């Protein structure tokens, strides 16, 4: 019949062959056009195991987005290894578009339709499709932006939630808008305070289903490169680094409500020219920002968290923002898919 397999996938997109924006440009040669009327077939009485943490689709997407970035966002200087590389570094238009991943002949994608499927285990409602949904390849840490939302309940996905070395992917039901704007390197981002606190209350409540009736604490990153200790992302081709202390700095007892004790949280940000690459070990330097107002607005649709360990602590659990491996970003979207080969 069929069985789990790894194969070379292809991508599909609605890219504009005329557009100068770099995702469009890449997708014009890397991908085919989307199918106007894609077919999805329910597999009656079929049960299948998935593992979002060992899904090779993720790796294929990762290598593609690496290629997109490499040929799109050229640094003035690269220090990959000990050798320094000088080159042209123009400002570009850079705004993600959805990319779909599809199986070639002889292979198929199975799709789990179970509500709040955690990404690992038996799916009861399976369908087959030729392509995934359209995934914007948004590169960020701490907050997942412009991603998919859970239908009904906040959903937690972790390879082992009690293993403090494992990332915890959180998917929200309601998005929280984050509005950013740009010493020409000084910038800042706003989130609605009431909305963000209601979210944390609900995230806390969900975490208690795994960790028990305990106090849930959100705290800032314990360390690492700036890309992961801040919410880093890009807007208008520029690399933003935003301090999220104002977002992760609260203690939620079992009886706590957002109502306890402007309605705006302002996050201080900086636009950096010197950055650590996510694709690759090494440093890249870009040109300063062009004069004028730089603005972008995104929806927070998920979080990347870690949890503190400890051999002794009852009473509370502490969670901190994390990320850095963009494969986890792709996983947050690809968790419900797996590739199979046909007889």
């Amino acid at each position: 019949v069929w069985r789990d397999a790894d194969t070379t996938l292809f991508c599909a997109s609605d890219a504009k062959a005329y557009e100068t924006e770099k995702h469009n440009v890449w997708a014009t040669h890397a991908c085919v056009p989307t199918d106007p009327n894609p077919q999805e077939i329910h597999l009656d009485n079929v049960t299948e195991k998935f593992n979002m943490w060992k899904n090779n689709m993720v790796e294929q997407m990762h290598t593609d987005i690496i290629s997109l970035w490499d040929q799109s966002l050229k640094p003035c200087v690269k220090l990959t290894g000990g050798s320094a590389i000088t080159q042209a570094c123009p400002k570009v238009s850079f705004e993600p578009i959805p990319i779909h991943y599809c199986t070639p002949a002889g292979f198929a994608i199975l799709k789990c339709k179970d509500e709040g499927f955690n990404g690992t285990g038996l799916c009861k409602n399976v369908s087959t499709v030729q392509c995934t949904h359209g995934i914007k390849p948004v590169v960020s840490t701490q907050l997942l932006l412009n991603g998919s939302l859970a239908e009904k309940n906040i959903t937690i996905r972790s390879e082992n939630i009690t293993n403090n070395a494992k990332i915890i992917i959180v998917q929200l039901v309601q998005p929280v808008t984050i509005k950013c704007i740009r010493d020409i390197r000084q910038a800042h981002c706003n989130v609605t305070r009431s909305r963000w606190n209601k979210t944390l209350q609900e995230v806390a409540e969900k975490l208690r289903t795994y960790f028990g009736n305990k106090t849930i604490i959100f705290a800032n990153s314990s360390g690492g490169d700036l890309e992961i200790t801040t919410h880093s992302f890009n807007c208008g081709g520029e690399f933003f680094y935003c301090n999220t202390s104002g977002l992760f700095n609260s203690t939620w007892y079992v009886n706590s409500t957002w109502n306890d004790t402007n309605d705006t949280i302002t996050l201080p940000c900086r636009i950096k020219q010197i950055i650590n690459m996510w694709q690759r070990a090494g440093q890249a330097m870009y040109a300063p920002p062009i004069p004028g107002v730089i603005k972008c607005e995104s929806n927070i649709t998920g979080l990347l968290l870690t949890r503190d360990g400890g051999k002794d602590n009852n009473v509370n659990e502490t969670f901190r923002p994390g990320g850095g491996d963009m494969r986890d970003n792709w996983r947050s979207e690809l968790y419900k898919y797996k590739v199979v080969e046909i007889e």
């Epitope: 009690t162 070395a165 360390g223 070990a281 870690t306 360990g309 400890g310 051999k311 850095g324």
Partner: antibody, heavy 121, light 104 residues
Framework: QVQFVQSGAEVKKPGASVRVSCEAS????????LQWIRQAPGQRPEWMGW????????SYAPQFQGRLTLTRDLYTETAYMHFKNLRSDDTAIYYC??????????????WGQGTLVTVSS | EIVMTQSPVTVSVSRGGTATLSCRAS??????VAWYQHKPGQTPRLLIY???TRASGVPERFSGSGFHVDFTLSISGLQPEDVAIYYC?????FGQGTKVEIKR
């Protein structure tokens, strides 16, 4: 072969600070969690924290939060443990170690030779 | 909060016999347990991981069986060189250790 070479023994007064280094070789340094473990006399092993060298993400045992920092140097593939405000019961052998597999970060197959840190007046 | 409780405190078995060491978890932890040998003044040595998998280089007389909350390390054909303290581990948490000696 996977191998970790640590710095030499340290002797300190209470309140002082120590830095222990751990030189990694024989594997892809950025693809594995690196664990720090100590063992004091007559005591079981005690987890200090870990570091993921690719971007330097860390986790610190709660009892050491505020005086423990873990860093790395990717050019020399060396990890460092910085441990401050030392107390006499910090006297122990300190190790860096690595798991059997990338997805088995706790099952410590490979250990540095250990570093004795003695803290006393 | 996870507690790993080892027993007995001391195992005393004649040479060539089998030592059976137990480790109980305070809550279910699947197969996620490891065992170490420790001799004073030496680096701890991984014996068994994932409850039952023998680590590279470890003699075949060491074996493990465990799941959920109960975990066992067995040493058949006990040798004087196996005299040591043995620790179980669940991620960052370690048991208190069990000493194994030769009975003579």
């Amino acid at each position: 072969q996977v191998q970790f070479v640590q710095s030499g023994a340290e002797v300190k007064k209470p309140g002082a600070s120590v830095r222990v280094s751990c030189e990694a070789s024989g594997y892809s340094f950025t693809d594995y969690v690196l664990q720090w473990i100590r063992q004091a006399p007559g005591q079981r092993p005690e987890w200090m924290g870990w570091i993921k060298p690719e971007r330097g993400a860390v986790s610190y045992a709660p009892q050491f939060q505020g005086r423990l920092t873990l860093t790395r140097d990717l050019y020399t593939e060396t990890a460092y443990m910085h441990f401050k405000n030392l107390r006499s019961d910090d006297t122990a052998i300190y190790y860096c170690a690595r798991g059997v597999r990338r997805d088995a970060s706790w099952w410590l197959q490979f250990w540095g030779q250990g570093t004795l840190v003695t803290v006393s007046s | 909060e996870i507690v790993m409780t080892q027993s007995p405190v001391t195992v005393s078995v004649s040479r060539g016999g089998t030592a059976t060491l137990s480790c109980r978890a305070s809550q279910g932890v699947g197969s996620d347990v490891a065992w170490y040998q420790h001799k004073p003044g030496q680096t701890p040595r991984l014996l068994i991981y994932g409850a039952s998998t023998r680590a590279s280089g470890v003699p075949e007389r060491f074996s493990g069986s465990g799941f959920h909350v109960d975990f066992t390390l067995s040493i058949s054909g006990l040798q004087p060189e196996d005299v040591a303290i043995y620790y179980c581990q669940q991620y960052e948490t370690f048991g208190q250790g069990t000493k194994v000696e030769i009975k003579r």
